Amino acid sequence: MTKLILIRHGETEWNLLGKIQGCTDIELTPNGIQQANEVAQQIKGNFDIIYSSPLHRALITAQKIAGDKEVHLIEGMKEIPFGTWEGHTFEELNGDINYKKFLSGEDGCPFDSTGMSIASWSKKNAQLLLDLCKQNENKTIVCVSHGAWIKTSILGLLEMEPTMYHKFQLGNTGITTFIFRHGHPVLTSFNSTQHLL
Amino acid sequence: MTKLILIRHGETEWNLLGKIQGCTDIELTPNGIQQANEVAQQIKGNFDIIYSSPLHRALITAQKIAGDKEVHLIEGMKEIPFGTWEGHTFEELNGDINYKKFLSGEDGCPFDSTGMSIASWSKKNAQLLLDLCKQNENKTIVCVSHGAWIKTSILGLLEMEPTMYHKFQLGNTGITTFIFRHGHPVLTSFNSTQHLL
Numbered sequence: 001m002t003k004l005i006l007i008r009h010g011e012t013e014w015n016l017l018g019k020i021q022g023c024t025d026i027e028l029t030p031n032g033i034q035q036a037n038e039v040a041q042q043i044k045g046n047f048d049i050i051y052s053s054p055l056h057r058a059l060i061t062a063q064k065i066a067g068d069k070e071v072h073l074i075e076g077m078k079e080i081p082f083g084t085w086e087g088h089t090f091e092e093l094n095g096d097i098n099y100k101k102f103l104s105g106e107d108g109c110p111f112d113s114t115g116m117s118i119a120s121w122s123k124k125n126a127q128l129l130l131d132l133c134k135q136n137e138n139k140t141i142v143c144v145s146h147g148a149w150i151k152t153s154i155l156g157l158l159e160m161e162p163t164m165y166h167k168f169q170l171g172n173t174g175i176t177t178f179i180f181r182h183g184h185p186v187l188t189s190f191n192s193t194q195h196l197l
Numbered sequence: 198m199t200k201l202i203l204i205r206h207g208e209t210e211w212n213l214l215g216k217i218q219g220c221t222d223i224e225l226t227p228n229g230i231q232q233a234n235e236v237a238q239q240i241k242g243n244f245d246i247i248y249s250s251p252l253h254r255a256l257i258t259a260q261k262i263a264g265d266k267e268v269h270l271i272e273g274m275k276e277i278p279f280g281t282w283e284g285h286t287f288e289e290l291n292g293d294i295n296y297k298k299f300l301s302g303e304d305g306c307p308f309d310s311t312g313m314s315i316a317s318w319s320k321k322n323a324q325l326l327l328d329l330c331k332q333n334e335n336k337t338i339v340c341v342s343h344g345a346w347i348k349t350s351i352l353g354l355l356e357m358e359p360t361m362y363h364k365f366q367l368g369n370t371g372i373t374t375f376i377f378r379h380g381h382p383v384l385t386s387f388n389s390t391q392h393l394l
Contacts, residue, residue: 042391158361158364159364160357160361164355164357166383167355167381167382167383167384168383168384168385169376169383169384169385171385179366184364185364186363186364186365186366187364187365187366187387187388188366188368188388189371189387189388189389189390190384190386190387190388191384191385191386191387191389192386192388192389192390192391193386193389194239194372194389194391194392195391
């Protein structure tokens with residue numbers, strides 16, 4: 001009865017503008033702080049351990065959810081880097097050879113000029129997540145992270161192809177949960193946002 | 198701004214028992230009625246049109262959600278037929294040539310010997326849902342249906358491979374939404390169940 005709970009952080013200013021926010025340590029907006037509270041309430045402490053990205057937008061979200069538990073930082077849960085895309089909107093990326101390969105699945109859907117892609121991040125982030133579940137078997141695990149990172153984890157966990165990435169939309173504070181049957185992750189929910197008013 | 202919302206019906210006794218429940222017109226349990234009220238309370242009439250399976254369990258659920266709106270009956274929203282499987286638990290299906298295929302992926306994962314597979318229903322149910330959307334553009338559509346039906350609809354809509362069916366788990370009153378970008382369905386929720394108290 002291992003349960004994995006992945007939670008995208010609250011709203012930032014860059015999120016509102018559509019600016020690709022990777023490694024830039026943007027803070028929550030005031031609405032984003034509220035999203036974190038509302039999602040903390042829904043949880044009502046129903047978990048054993050809670051992990052988080054080191055970026056403040058995640059970490060602050062995690063801390064509200066945790067109440068009185070320690071929030072464990074995992075550096076591997078930081079958001080995926082986007083290189084020369086950082087700061088840009090997707091409209092500003094039209095006619096970038098790498099972005100046409102992102103939409104198209106060519107080359108595993110490369111992220112900018114980082115050397116990495118949806119394909120690699122999926123294996124890589126799925127590997128991390130499993131080991132973290134073996135480490136905490138028969139427990140309910142929460143992980144506060146980011147949109148590109150959580151989406152690739154879903155693709156990695158359920159073995160989907162890189163292009164499926166674009167068929168998911170994961171909003172702020174959206175909950176995504178798995179369980180295991182028998183050794184394989186089973187998606188029991190994705191981007192649940194009913195706690196948002 | 199076309200939104201498609203797929204909702205599974207409330208609990209029945211056969212659900213409680215793990216009994217495959219297709220053509221049998223089983224009523225809701227009082228819990229399952231409560232479920233229906235809850236999901237209705239969460240939806241608060243935020244939809245334009247609402248469709249339903251004819252089977253009682255769905256209709257009753259849709260009826261509570263619809264309030265004073267008309268529930269529109271679609272014959273093809275009926276649960277997938279399961280043939281011989283009907284009335285059985287998967288355990289009892291331990292050792293059937295077809296059930297092994299249903300897991301293994303052979304012949305597009307057959308259901309009983311109904312002659313149809315997950316493959317076929319993915320295509321068929323998506324085609325219906327796309328058409329129901331093309332006919333309701335820039336409206337929010339709710340559709341009350343069944344577990345297998347909705348799951349194949351997802352595989353169809355997101356063009357996934359039939360074995361993925363087993364990597365999804367849908368609960369009673371589970372909500373599942375789609376939007377379009379540009380004209381391709383994008384999943385924005387799966388199995389949201391926050392309304393259950």
